[PDB]
Design a binder for this molecule. Structure first.
Ligand code: CHL
Ligand code: CHL
Ligand code: CLA
Ligand code: CLA
Ligand code: CLA
Ligand code: CLA
Ligand code: CLA
Ligand code: CLA
Ligand code: CLA
Ligand SMILES: CC1=C[C@H](O)CC(C)(C)[C@H]1/C=C/C(C)=C/C=C/C(C)=C/C=C/C=C(C)/C=C/C=C(C)/C=C/C1=C(C)C[C@H](O)CC1(C)C
Ligand code: SF4
Lengths: 63, 203, 41, 203, 160, 80
């Protein structure tokens, strides 16, 4: 599943720090039952200092 | 081709097709796609208004120095009285400039659209390139047509004579601001004592 | 100078060198042209 | 290889390829290869301006002491009155050196680009190294263009070491005028009489 | 204009010139006339007399306090109080705003974009600080071409 | 007392439990992540409300979330 590994996606999740921000997909989990399989890496950190977050494919579009 | 600065790379937008191209865009004012079409039309009116400007600033002042016209100076020509009011002649100009420049505005925006007459449509302008309205009203001698290498030379001669006139007219402006003397007398005061009539002495 | 000029290009040094030049310029404007309340040009 | 400090190891950036290279870099400011080529270019025009400086400081003041010429001292030479004012003597020189050093600025950045005369393209400079332009205007005797490289390096080494003595001399003339308030030829003849006492500690 | 006399014919403005030199002349009475601190007060008096003769010659408006007041409405007499040095300012302030904006675009497309802001790339900086000279033609040029503003779909927006 | 809620954005990184100073959080099995575990708050009546778990949660936005509600002698942290 997922759009593609190594692709550029835009986050549609409202409560994330990287909403409407360009991110790079580093891992998509193909195991069933995982709610947020797509792991997206960002060039900028959030207030917690991390750049790695998991999103569903419904919360991302290819840009 | 020769450039404005030897050892400097020419910009990617100024490729050398345009007449008068010496790769001189250091501040990148014509980089953007579609922008160099506007800046040639801007250069062409400014160069032709300055050659019209230099023929009305220096040539009547030079013949005043000989004394066969007795025309007033150009910076005091706005105070001169005529058959019309000086304020009135501004607005009659910009009603005529509203016609002549908006016909020119549509040529830059939509080329090949306003070459036909608004009244008698058999009269059509023969100009093909943008910024060169060939026709009986503007080029009656037909000097704007021929080979492309021959046409590039006479278009190079408009803007090289035009850039000199722009510098000229910008020079007369600052000369009349800090010295308050007309610019033919500024030339004749520079052929008498050149090392004492300089921009540092005039501040 | 692969690293000395990198230190000289840091944010506090370049702020000191620019504002040293900036306050150096505005003081020297305020010597030859002091008490300037109205721009004449 | 002669070195400035015979026990010390020579620096890596000073490999002896440059003329007048004696390994003197205790602060190591020529460590960057891009900045070393700028500093060699900075040292060349420093050397030749100081040798031209030392021929206008120590040569005519020796003729002033010997009575050959009635030229003023080098400290008060700019204070004298000429046919051109010294404020507007600078902007004549600044304009003339915007073509002399500005075209020299391109040769340091882009080698082999400003070697062709723009007015007449047949005239060109017979030079291949940065900082040594050659040609008829700068090397009319052809001594700087030799086939052998060992004699050519020593002649450029002879140019540098003659230069850096004058950079000590013109700096020496500046501090002598600030300390003794006397011309450096007159400081030499005061020192040639009693060298034990007439020194910097004579106060 | 606005009930203010010109400063060249203001009796209160000439009173402040009289009582400022008199304050400095009484400071000069306790020094030798050729002394070094007396040359500073003598240079202060000539700086004061240059100042008052400059304010009256620019058509400044002086109130009942004897003080020069600025008319910032855009009067044809009063352009150098606000309009002329405001356009001089906004050109310089837009120069600061254009070369700082163009530096961030030039370092966003880099390998480490955050190391180029603590350590400012001077050859990259100085090649666009010259380019900030012609900035109204480049700001409205980017405004007309759409490169000045970013679309709201690519802008980080806090949720409702 | 305090209501600690775990959401489905959790990756099972366990550091919310490790940052807990009053043993509220525990890791239960789950099927929604690679680690196959999610946090839970059974002893939420022992929660002081310090939000050390929210400081240690790397998920944006947070998976553990502490809502300060009615406060008792457990959630006031008193010894008297
Ligand atoms: C676009 C070129 C152009 C330039 C450089 C000038 C420049 C000038 N006009 Mg002017 N005018 C120009 C076009 C026109 N003027 C006028 C009508 C006037 C009048 C009535 C007056 C001026 C005056 C002036 C001078 C002082 C104004 C000033 O401080 O400017 C910044 C200045 C030399 C004044 C003057 O001559 O006083 C010395 C003056 O009274 N102009 C008309 C309408 C016919 C123009 C057409 O576009
Ligand atoms: C300011 C003029 C000036 C400049 C630009 C240079 C530049 C140079 N000298 Mg130099 N010199 C200068 C004046 C003098 N030198 C010397 C004596 C020497 C020796 C013996 C040697 C050099 C060498 C060098 C080169 C070493 C690289 C370097 O670290 O440069 C950094 C230097 C500067 C940026 C100038 C100093 C800055 C200022 C003090 C503040 C470099 C081209 C070495 C070489 O290999 O040459 C080919 C070498 O062996 N110089 C004397 C006699 C005391 C000078 C005059 O006072
Ligand atoms: C308003 C004046 C004006 C305009 C429209 C242009 C337009 C053009 N010039 Mg330029 N030119 C002019 C003045 C002008 N010129 C004058 C007077 C000189 C002589 C000093 C030249 C010398 C020149 C050379 C040698 C070349 C250009 C070229 C260019 C082109 C690309 C750069 C650009 O877009 O500049 C846009 C410029 C402006 C919008 C003017 C901004 C002025 C700022 C706001 C203030 C400047 C203060 C001034 C120094 C006083 C374009 C066709 C190149 C080309 O290919 O031409 C076909 C070329 O190589 N120009
Ligand atoms: C855009 C260009 C420009 C502008 C602003 C003007 C405008 C001016 N010129 Mg000038 N002039 C120009 C170009 C320019 N000139 C050129 C191309 C030449 C020919 C080489 C002259 C020759 C010239 C002369 C001989 C005189 C002026 C005069 C005039 C004034 C009134 C024009 C007139 O009599 O109506 C003409 C109306 C027509 C319909 C034609 C006015 C200040 C006159 C002046 O200073 O007032 C006494 C004057 O006697 N000009
Ligand atoms: C130095 C003067 C100069 C030069 C070299 C030219 C050159 C050019 N112009 Mg230009 N132009 C100029 C002045 C100049 N113009 C000025 C001052 C204006 C405003 C009145 C115009 C208005 C203008 C338009 C709008 C058009 C041209 C066109 C022409 C082209 C053919 C006509 C020709 O050979 O002119 C030769 C010029 C001279 C011999 C100068 C005469 C000087 C007298 C004696 C004063 C050519 C590229 C035409 C074109 O390209 O159409 C296809 C066209 O219709 N120009
Ligand atoms: C076609 C170009 C050109 C020509 C040939 C002249 C020629 C002349 N100008 Mg000049 N002038 C020019 C453009 C031109 N100017 C420009 C573009 C400016 C506006 C910044 C000025 C502003 C100016 C001032 C304020 C003064 C002159 C004066 C002079 C004379 C002495 C040169 C000097 O000290 O100022 C040269 C100043 C420059 C800025 C050089 C610019 C020239 C390049 C080619 C453009 C000389 C006869 C002086 C005068 O009245 O003579 C008695 C004087 O007081 N000019
Ligand atoms: C945004 C606020 C602001 C504004 C509009 C001005 C603007 C001005 N002040 Mg300034 N001033 C300000 C804040 C401000 N000041 C503050 C914060 C300080 C305290 C550090 C001062 C202390 C100050 C000094 C000491 C001097 C100026 C001067 C000036 C003039 C600068 C002329 C020049 O070429 O340089 C100008 C009228 C000089 C001047 O000509 O006085 C009129 C001058 O004497 N001001
Ligand atoms: C080309 C180099 C050079 C030469 C030959 C001279 C020569 C002279 N200087 Mg000196 N001087 C030099 C550069 C030079 N200086 C420099 C770089 C400075 C700046 C620090 C000064 C500042 C200076 C002062 C302020 C005074 C002298 C004075 C003197 C005279 C007395 C000697 C003395 O006290 O030396 C003092 C020497 C120094 C302070 C610096 C040492 C000079 C260089 C750097 C070292 C030697 C370099 C080189 C090996 C010299 C080769 C000499 C060779 C041709 C024989 C003597 C004629 C005095 C005078 O007027 O005498 C009456 C005087 O008061 N000098
Ligand atoms: C790189 C240049 C740059 C650019 C083009 C702007 C432009 C913008 N900023 Mg500013 N700003 C910057 C630097 C910049 N800023 C920096 C360095 C800081 C930290 C001091 C801020 C802090 C900041 C605040 C606090 C505010 C703005 C806002 C604004 C807007 C109006 C200008 C303003 O309020 O005055 C400028 C405001 C300042 C506090 C002055 C800082 C400008 C410095 C001196 C420039 C440094 C550049 C140099 C290369 C380093 C505009 C979108 C306002 C906004 O939200 O938009 C409407 C607003 O509230 N900015
Ligand atoms: C290298 C090194 C190594 C590491 O880096 C460390 C260190 C230590 C840093 C170093 C070193 C350094 C040094 C020593 C420096 C110095 C320099 C100099 C002194 C120069 C001068 C230089 C100098 C020069 C050019 C000079 C010039 C001159 C001139 C023009 C003159 C003129 C004149 C004349 C004729 C005469 C008249 O009447 C007057 C006049 C007009 C006045
Ligand atoms: S710290 Fe956050 S992401 Fe990690 S296990 Fe606890 S609730 Fe889940």
């Amino acid at each position: 599943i997922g759009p593609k590994r190594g692709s550029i996606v835009k986050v549609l999740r409202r409560e994330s720090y990287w909403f409407n921000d360009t991110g790079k997909v580093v891992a998509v989990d193909q195991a069933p039952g995982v709610r947020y399989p797509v792991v997206v890496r960002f060039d900028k950190v959030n207030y917690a200092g991390v750049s790695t977050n998991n999103y569903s494919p419904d919360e991302l579009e290819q840009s | 081709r020769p450039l404005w600065l030897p050892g400097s790379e020419a910009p990617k937008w100024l490729d050398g097709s345009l007449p008068g191209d010496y790769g001189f865009d250091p501040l990148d004012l014509a980089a953007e796609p579609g922008r160099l079409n506007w800046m040639v039309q801007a250069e062409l009116v400014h160069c032709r208004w300055a050659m019209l400007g230099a023929a009305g600033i220096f040539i009547p002042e030079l013949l005043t120095k000989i004394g066969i016209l007795n025309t007033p100076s150009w910076y005091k020509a706005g105070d001169a009285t005529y058959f019309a009011d000086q304020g009135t002649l501004f607005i009659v100009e910009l009603l005529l400039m509203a016609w002549a420049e908006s016909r020119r505005w549509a040529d830059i925006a939509r080329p090949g659209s306003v070459n036909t007459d608004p009244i008698f449509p058999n009269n059509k302008l023969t100009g093909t390139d943008v910024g060169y309205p060939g026709g009986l009203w503007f080029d009656p001698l037909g000097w704007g047509s021929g080979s492309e290498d021959k046409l590039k030379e006479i278009r190079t001669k408009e803007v090289k004579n035009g850039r000199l006139a722009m510098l000229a007219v910008l020079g007369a402006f600052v000369q009349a601001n800090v010295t308050h003397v007309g610019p033919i007398d500024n030339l004749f005061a520079h052929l008498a004592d050149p090392y004492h009539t300089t921009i540092l002495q005039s501040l | 100078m692969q690293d000395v000029k990198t230190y000289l290009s840091t944010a506090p040094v370049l702020a000191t060198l620019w504002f040293g030049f900036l306050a150096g310029l505005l003081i020297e404007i305020n010597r030859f042209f002091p008490d300037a309340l109205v721009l004449p040009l | 290889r002669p070195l400035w400090f015979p026990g010390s190891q020579p620096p890596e950036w000073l490999d002896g390829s440059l003329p007048g290279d004696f390994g003197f870099d205790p602060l190591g400011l020529g460590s960057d290869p891009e900045l070393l080529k700028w500093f060699v270019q900075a040292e060349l025009v420093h050397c030749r301006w100081a040798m031209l400086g030392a021929a206008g400081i120590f040569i005519p003041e020796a003729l002033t002491k010997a009575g050959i010429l009635n030229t003023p001292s080098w400290t008060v030479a700019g204070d004298q009155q000429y046919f051109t004012d010294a404020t507007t003597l600078f902007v004549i020189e600044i304009i003339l050196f915007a073509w002399a050093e500005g075209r020299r600025w391109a040769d340091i950045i882009n080698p082999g680009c400003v070697n062709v005369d723009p007015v007449f393209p047949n005239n060109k400079l017979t030079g291949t190294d940065v900082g040594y332009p050659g040609g008829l205007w700068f090397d009319p005797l052809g001594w700087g263009q030799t086939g052998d490289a060992a004699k050519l390096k020593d002649l450029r080494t002879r140019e540098i070491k003659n230069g850096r003595l004058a950079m000590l001399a013109v700096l020496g003339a500046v501090v002598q005028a600030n300390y003794t308030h006397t011309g450096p030829i007159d400081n030499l003849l005061a020192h040639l009489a009693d060298p034990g006492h007439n020194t910097i500690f004579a106060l | 204009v606005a009930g203010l006399t010109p400063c060249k014919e203001s009796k209160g403005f000439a009173k402040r010139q009289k009582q400022e030199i008199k304050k400095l002349e009484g400071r000069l009475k306790l020094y030798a006339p050729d002394s070094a601190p007396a040359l500073a007060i003598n240079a202060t008096i000539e700086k004061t007399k240059r100042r008052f003769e400059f304010y009256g010659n620019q058509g400044l408006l002086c109130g009942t306090d004897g003080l020069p007041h600025l008319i910032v409405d855009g009067d044809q007499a009063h352009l150098g109080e606000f309009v002329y040095p405001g356009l001089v300012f906004l050109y310089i302030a837009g120069w600061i705003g254009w070369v700082g904006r163009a530096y961030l675009i030039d370092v966003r497309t880099s390998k480490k974009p955050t190391e180029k802001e603590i350590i400012i790339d001077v050859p990259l900086a100085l090649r666009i600080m010259s380019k900030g000279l012609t900035w109204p033609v480049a700001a409205i040029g980017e405004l007309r071409s759409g490169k000045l503003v970013e679309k709201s779909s690519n802008i980080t927006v806090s949720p409702r | 007392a305090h209501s600690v809620k775990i959401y489905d954005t959790c990756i099972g990184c366990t550091q919310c439990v490790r940052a807990c100073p009053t043993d509220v959080l525990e890791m239960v099995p789950w099927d929604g992540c690679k680690a196959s575990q999610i946090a839970s708050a059974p002893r939420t009546e022992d929660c002081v409300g310090c939000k050390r778990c929210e400081s240690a949660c790397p998920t944006d936005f947070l998976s553990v979330r502490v809502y300060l509600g009615a406060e008792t002698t457990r959630s006031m942290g008193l010894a008297y």
